[PDB]
Amino acid sequence: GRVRTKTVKKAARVIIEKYYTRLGNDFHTNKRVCEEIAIIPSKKLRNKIAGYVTHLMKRIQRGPVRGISIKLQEEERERRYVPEVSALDQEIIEVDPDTKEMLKLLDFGSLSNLQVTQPTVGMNFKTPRG
Amino acid sequence: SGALDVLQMKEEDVLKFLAAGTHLGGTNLDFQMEQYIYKRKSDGIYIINLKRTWEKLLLAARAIVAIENPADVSVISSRNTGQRAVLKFAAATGATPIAGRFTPGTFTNQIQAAFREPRLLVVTDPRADHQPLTEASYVNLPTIALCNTDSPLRYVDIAIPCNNKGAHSVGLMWWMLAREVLRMRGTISREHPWEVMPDLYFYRDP
Amino acid sequence: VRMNVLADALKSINNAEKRGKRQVLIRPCSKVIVRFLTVMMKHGYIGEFEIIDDHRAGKIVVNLTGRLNKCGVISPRFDVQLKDLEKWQNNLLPSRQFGFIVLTTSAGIMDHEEARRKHTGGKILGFFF
Amino acid sequence: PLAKDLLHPSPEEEKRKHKKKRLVQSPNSYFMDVKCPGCYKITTVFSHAQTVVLCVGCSTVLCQPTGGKARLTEGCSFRRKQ
Amino acid sequence: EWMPVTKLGRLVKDMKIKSLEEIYLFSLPIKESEIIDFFLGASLKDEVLKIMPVQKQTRAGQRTRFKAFVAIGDYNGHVGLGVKCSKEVATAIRGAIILAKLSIVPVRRGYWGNKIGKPHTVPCKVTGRCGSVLVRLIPAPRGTGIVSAPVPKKLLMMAGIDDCYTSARGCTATLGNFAKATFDAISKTYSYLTPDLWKETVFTKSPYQEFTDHLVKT
Amino acid sequence: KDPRRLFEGNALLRRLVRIGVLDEGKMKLDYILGLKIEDFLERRLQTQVFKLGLAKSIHHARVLI
Amino acid sequence: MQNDAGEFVDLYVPRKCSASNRIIGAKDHASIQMNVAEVDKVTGRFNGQFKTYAICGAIRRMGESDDSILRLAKADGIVSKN
Amino acid sequence: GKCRGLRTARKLRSHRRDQKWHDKQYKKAHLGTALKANPFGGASHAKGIVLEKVGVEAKQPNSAIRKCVRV
RNA sequence: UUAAAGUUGCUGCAGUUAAAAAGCUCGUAGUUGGAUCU
RNA sequence: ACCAUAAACGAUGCCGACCGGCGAUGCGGCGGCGUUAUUCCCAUGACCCGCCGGGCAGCUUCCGGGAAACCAAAGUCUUUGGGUUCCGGGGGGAGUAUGGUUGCAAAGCUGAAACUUAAAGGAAUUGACGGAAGGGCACCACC
């Protein structure tokens, strides 16, 4: 089979976590940047690493990769977002009657944005055990 | 928040709490968490008293401000719904974030380069982050956590009673704790609202 | 059935002091128990308590300051002569520097150090340290 | 737990316990004051009554006894004393 | 050369911590033995108690390893007890010496009768317990010496107890359970709350708090 | 303040002071527990003959006596 | 602790748990010492003082360290009533 | 558990002196059958007439002939 | 023969699996017995 | 009609107090939105949400034990005393012989000694085995 051992994958992962800006989606460009950054002996190891770097940079664009740093993997997504109004800036907030009793003890019964919905009338919230 | 008019919960904070859903707990109730519940309504969901969520948050903020070097506080979320709010708590505050899997032996194995020695531990969920809780009982490390109604309170020392299942509630709690620790320090004033919108902390999934 | 009602109260405030609790409810109260607790409080081991009046028998809510290590009864109440007091405090007490043995003497219920001072023997109720 | 005021429970908490497990025990019963609809007499009735109480004027039943609490007849208005 | 890796070893090496009693007061865990070598050092003596060969059966035969039980102690001071297993007896003994330095506790000493002089015995009756073996230390008057078996006598004399009464129970032929049981009793002498320890504890700053401005330069 | 402790506690101290094993200023009953074997072995006549310059070893003194 | 002449004959005086008065031992690695910051009562900013609470490891393994911190801080007026 | 009351002295000592007979050392030295089976009759030494020299064979995990005497 | 033997145990042992708790209930002696009176 | 004996087993005296949680279930009682049936109405029945009290169980836990397996009792034990019954004292000889006693009898209860012996025994851990059951692999196996 073609299963890459942990030498290839370890060196590829630490090159990803150190040089995410220099890398891309082409194999042959990543082949050239690893051979100047890293001191790698005989050529068959340099080629196997750079293929995993290409296959790994393909996968980071689609979401998370568990082997590499979270801080970097999340930050790139952010860098690669502001909504114009906040999701917590609502006009109608639907609360229960029991919630409004809590706000009444919080002396916040004088809120305008509340809309006291009625709760459902059936007391059914458990699974029919058996 | 010792009966000070400067520190009382205002109207907009209550509106954000109600919009995010941080008052609605879970279906079950731990016996250690019974102190913070207003009442269980119908549909079996417990309502968290927001006056006690606000005062436990203000007590945790004093515990974070009482540490001189701000990098000695560590902030931990091992599930994805709180991984973004931890990384922005540490950029606004100056703490040390640990997102993703906590390595067993981060606090006790002193040989490794993964070894850290914090002075305070803030945790997004005491059930999901069970491993950094138990390791704090080896190195004399106090612990703040965001606790739901079913959360166990073994080794938590300040138990902020919020909702931590929904993605908006976690981000709002981390945002409001960041605002409180920055307000209690010498930086941003209590007059104007904070520049950071609280949607920088939410976890928008795909 | 419940015999030796003082053995109940001393086991209750032993088991609650181990659990770190602040208050114990012991029931039923008795006048032997109140005089035992008064000896412990005057040497600093428990703190104030409130006797609750039911018309049947009391209950006592004792406050706990976490200074108690062990509170025990001795059953049966052996007769203790004043020459025999040293063997009892060799067996029961953990040190010659602290701890007390509670005797019922005919001058009242008192600790073993006061009973020597009043030059009195009696019967043993228990011990605390 | 571990710091709970045993001297002063809340009044909705002593109401919840069993009647002998309270701080000072007290019964769950009361004396109602049953009015017969087709009469004028007002009768003192125990709430957990055994054998069936007859208003001696109208000679009609006021409460058939049950397992726990005496079940009134249809239309007998009652108030609880003190 | 000692290049310390913990926050505490960097404080110990830079003369910020003046005694082992500060680390004991704040109950900080000690992960480097060079802290102990820095503090006690020239007055710290060790005794090998038993070299114990243990055997695991394997597919190829059986591996024999060797278990060393090393008690270390500063006489008048502190006492520790380390156990290390290895395939070689010299490395087992050196690792048990490190592990015995690492687990060093203070022992509180008291008076039998009136408090005239320096403390000489245990403050009260303390029982240690480890795997069926019960060891009980009873306070003795000035000058009786240690009245014990020859195994707890080593640890007790290394701890600095002048004179004590002892009573054992269980299967004391197992020298491991009989050494760690008395070590559990010696380590209980500070955990016992006696009436002289009844005052309110004025708190002081932890070494990670007071030297937070020195620790950031490194 | 017991009479046996005051009476036999003072005879026992007087004998130790008299044969030179205690000190005069150390006449409380608790210093008896701080006595050692060598304090009694100093008061043998053999060691006194050696220590007063009559002999020239501890073995010349026994054979002199 | 003290002899008859009055010297202090003790290596160190160990701390006590602020919730339950237990002696925090030398190898009690679950025990806590925690500062809670004090604020100025007109700006709500960190004064510089704090309030130290120590809690032993058995209280924290019980799960009772949250309530104990809460009632210690409530007695100092750091957490207001209710 | 055992009785503990202030008037239990007859129950305590009649139980101990009946459970004392279940000990091998007490039953041997207080019954009298073992003394009647002892050929010395309780003496430390005795005297006899040598009847014959006898070679007794050692028990299994070693091997020799022990030189005994029937007396 | 005594200590060692907390292997006779009142102080002071043990009885799920190492020796060991009665098939079950009744029940005399014995043992033990709730508060309460300056 | 006698016999009265069992892995008669929770392989676990009885009575009493204290000591963690969690959800079910059985019975009785107390409350509570709302579904159904008795045409309405209460009153009840079937459900649903609780609470209280005893019960049969279960899950869970650094309560504390214990040689450990395990145990919310097998905990509150060298910090050893709540009350009380039966019963054990290294392995065999042997529940054998004899005596007494009940029973028609089988059997029941009671029950030794001489002598022999340095171990027998309990938990747990690593390996060893197959004519136990499941997986992976090799043209020095097969197809």
Author numbering:
A (entry chain S): 2 to 81, 84 to 133
B (entry chain B): 2 to 207
C (entry chain W): 2 to 130
D (entry chain b): 2 to 83
E (entry chain D): 59 to 276
F (entry chain J): 66 to 130
G (entry chain Z): 1 to 82
H (entry chain X): 2 to 72
What does the paper say about this structure?
Once inside host cells, not only does the virus hijack the cells' translational machinery to make viral proteins, but the virulence factor nonstructural protein 1 (Nsp1) also shuts down translation of host messenger RNA. In summary, Nsp1 from both SARS-CoV and SARS-CoV-2 binds 40S and 80S ribosomes and disrupts cap-dependent translation. All observed ribosomal complexes displayed the same binding mode of Nsp1 to the 40S subunit, in which the C-terminal domain of Nsp1 (Nsp1-C) is rigidly bound inside the mRNA entry channel. Our data establish that one of the major immune evasion factors of SARS-CoV-2, Nsp1, efficiently interferes with the cellular translation machinery, resulting in a shutdown of host protein production.
Structural analysis revealed 40S and 80S ribosomal complexes in nine compositionally different states. All of them displayed density for the Nsp1 C terminus in an identical position and conformation observed in the in vitro–assembled complex, and all complexes lacked density corresponding to mRNA. The Nsp1-bound 40S ribosomal complexes could be divided into three major populations. The second population comprises unusual, pre-40S-like complexes, in which the cytosolic ribosome biogenesis factor TSR1 is bound in two distinct conformations between the 40S head and body. These complexes do not resemble any known on-pathway biogenesis intermediates. The stable association of Nsp1 in the cell with multiple different intermediate states of translation initiation besides empty 40S ribosomal complexes is in agreement with the proposed role of Nsp1 as an inhibitor of translation initiation.
